[PDB]
Symmetry: C2
Subunit: 465 residues, 2 copies
């Protein structure tokens, strides 16, 4: 009937995705600086050299958040601004620390609680050259643990911390399909990388709980994405099992080692020895390493089982990922992202699925939003009238409302992706996710869309006091 007054809502951005200023104040190159220089890797042949220039427009971004009623804000820290070479024995740059510290002060003064992501895919390039970057089971968790501590220490006025954003994207697109940085294609390394990101997460959560959490009663967790599933043929039990296994390969991959203590049985049966075994030390780091559940969600798909055994390059659990069930019923209309079809029911079904499997944890929806098909080619007048994105936020947030208020899903926050149009990775600047239109051709000016002014009066209806 009503959301409690302690429910938060704001917007979400990512450092390399908006900041720009890639060489400014001694910022070291990330693996995405390197990746974008490879021709054909970004659809529009662009990079994050300028993006939204948000690094230099701190006062503007906070005024926009305030003017939209956002009392919370999720952003990420560019590691290579803090430690340009990344390693624990590498010199700390004070200029990026001072930058983000001044940003947090400028946020709190406007009354906006920050929610900070430590690792949003932009690993320092040097760590990748020095020892293999994410592939190193020994070095990277040590270097990330130190980097996390440097931030926990630098920003004591922050209580809401995030280790990794969507570790699945750093493993399969980064080491399996090669669509994301560093750009490798292996049948084995995406499973080693995911293991390394788990251990790195557990090490940082231990350091934070032991020394920095009780100072101001904060919290830290990992952010896992995940789209829901429905049987392609509801009458075929193989498609119901295929729907569950698909979710296990997407999300239980990282969540089962955190809440239950080991990888999903279904992945172990299929991957065998390519899926690593947690050492006792590694298991003590990862098991129970979430103060909260950081949840990204976007869509749902129909899942059809497969009759032949899985190939070596399979990453999704040997299933077909479709937009129509056997009877021809569609998930939803197309967006600019080929993988995103709106399905508000899958947002609530996912929240409930997380709850039942992990004993109803504290959930923060850290990303939710949509792209719009052809939006990048529309005239500015049509872009601001984004009824497709307005409708996308009303049905989903009201679905979240039902899961929280009726099912009892312990969800305590929601963050709309994104605050503004930005650099959608391999899609470039063609794919626009923001509730604020950004005109890249004319000084990266901001123009709030009909979706931006839409979320305050919606949450005012759903949250009490």
């Amino acid at each position: 009937m009503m959301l409690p007054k302690d429910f938060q809502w704001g917007f979400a951005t990512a450092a390399y995705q908006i900041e720009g200023a890639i060489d400014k104040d001694g910022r070291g190159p990330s693996i995405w600086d390197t990746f974008c220089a490879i021709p054909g890797k970004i659809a529009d042949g662009t990079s994050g050299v300028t993006a939204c220039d948000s690094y230099n427009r701190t006062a503007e971004d906070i005024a926009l958040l305030k003017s939209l009623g956002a009392k919370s804000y999720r952003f990420s820290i560019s590691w290579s601004r803090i430690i340009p070479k990344g390693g624990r024995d590498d010199p700390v740059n004070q200029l990026g620390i001072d930058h983000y510290a001044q940003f947090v002060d400028d946020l709190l003064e406007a009354g906006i609680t920050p929610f900070i992501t430590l690792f949003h895919w932009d690993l320092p390039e040097e760590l990748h050259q020095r020892y293999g970057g994410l592939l190193n089971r020994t070095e990277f968790p040590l270097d990330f643990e130190n980097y996390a501590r440097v931030m926990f220490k630098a920003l004591p006025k922050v209580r809401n911390w995030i280790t990794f954003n969507e570790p699945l994207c750093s493993a399969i697109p980064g080491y399996g399909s090669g669509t994301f940085a560093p750009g490798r294609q292996s049948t084995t390394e995406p499973w080693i990388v995911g293991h390394n990101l788990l251990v790195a997460h557990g090490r940082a959560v231990k350091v934070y709980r032991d020394e920095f959490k009780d100072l101001n009663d904060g919290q830290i967790g990992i952010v896992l994405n995940g789209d829901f599933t429905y049987p392609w043929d509801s009458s075929d039990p193989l498609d119901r099992e295929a729907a569950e296994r698909r979710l296990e390969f997407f999300t239980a991959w990282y969540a089962d080692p955190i809440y239950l203590g080991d990888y999903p049985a279904s992945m172990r049966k299929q991957l065998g020895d390519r899926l690593p075994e947690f050492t006792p030390e590694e298991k003590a780091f990862v098991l129970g390493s979430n103060d909260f559940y950081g949840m990204n969600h976007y869509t749902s798909n129909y899942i059809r089982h497969r009759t032949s055994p899985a190939t070596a390059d399979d990453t999704v659990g040997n299933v077909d990922v479709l937009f129509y069930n056997k009877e021809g019923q569609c998930i939803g209309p197309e967006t600019e992202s080929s993988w995103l079809r709106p399905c508000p029911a899958g947002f609530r079904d996912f929240l409930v699925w997380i709850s039942k499997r992990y004993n109803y944890p504290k959930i923060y929806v850290t990303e939710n939003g949509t792209s719009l098909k052809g939006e990048n080619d529309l005239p500015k007048e049509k872009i601001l009238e984004d009824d497709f994105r307005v409708n996308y936020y009303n049905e989903y947030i009201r679905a979240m409302f039902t899961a929280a208020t009726l099912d009892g899903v312990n969800v305590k926050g929601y963050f709309a992706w994104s605050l503004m149009d930005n650099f959608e990775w391999a899609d470039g600047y063609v794919t626009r996710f923001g509730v604020t239109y950004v005109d890249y051709e004319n000084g990266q000016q901001r123009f709030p869309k009909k979706s931006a002014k839409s979320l305050k009066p919606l949450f005012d209806e759903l949250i009490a006091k």
Copy 2:
């Protein structure tokens, strides 16, 4: 997208609540004729003596149905019209047979497929006096099986058959609380009656499958009511088990023995002696006796576990059936029915719950609808503007649409309760469930409400052409 074109939708009524003419053409009295005469059992001291006079308004109710776009119609045969004393060796009233035989011809002539309920709570009074009615595990299942064969032979044009409407209401309200006919109160008889009603269901199914089903490709099953549940406090695992346990005592009471072979374990644990066991001959009747799942659904509740062990007079499963949860969230707004709060998500929830527990059976929603608080005191013009009921159906039906097109729930029909305001049992006529207003004081005149005209344009949107 679109439901299949073979999806049925219509309206549902029941013999004693609409027919009247309780002694015309040789109708013996049922247990509800005896029940309404006892002072204090009926809220307004009424009976079904006249009801809607539908027994003498055949073509007119068929005209109302054809006018509202209904291609199907669910209705029940009065047992005591066919066999006034109910028994297998008792005389058969041909006038009752001819009455319902001509009604089927008129419905099929009007292009309306019938969906006939054999037993809608009107046990012939003579059976109750002869051997204890539903309490008799030997005599009653034999008299019901013969009464079913009579109607199978009498109505060969019928394909859609229903044994019992809501056996739980015959069991507990009629033998535990005394709120329904025959108005007894026992800690043991409800569980005996439910067993007898299950065996009474199997014998007729076997007779039908073996001697009447194959000629016109018919189907037969039982209709179970079930209101869905949500944990009162989702952080207490005892409240999630309690919400599941409540569904077991309420619906899996009858559905588990039909699909799985025996009563739920939780009911065995609480009841022990009082929960009978299926004999070798009984189990051959009950297990597998559903061509389709007949489902009645109305509302949902928050469920809180209990600290004390269950007392002998418990029927719900040792839980608290609430309208609010611990956090203060409400299910929905009040109706004239104290037990009914609109909750559309629970309809889809119960559909998927039936499907996951019973291998996704074919489902026919045989009753769904709502009453309106204060509707009986409103003026005539205010009654016809029943947007509350209009909104109820629109949400529940679209919730079902999502269930069928996304989750893949194999629901092939939907009947709205009710076609007209009628005798709502212990509530009298004050509780109005119809989409058609009935002026009882002015010759039971029909006046369709805004809801009656709402269904056709909606199903025209959701059913393929």
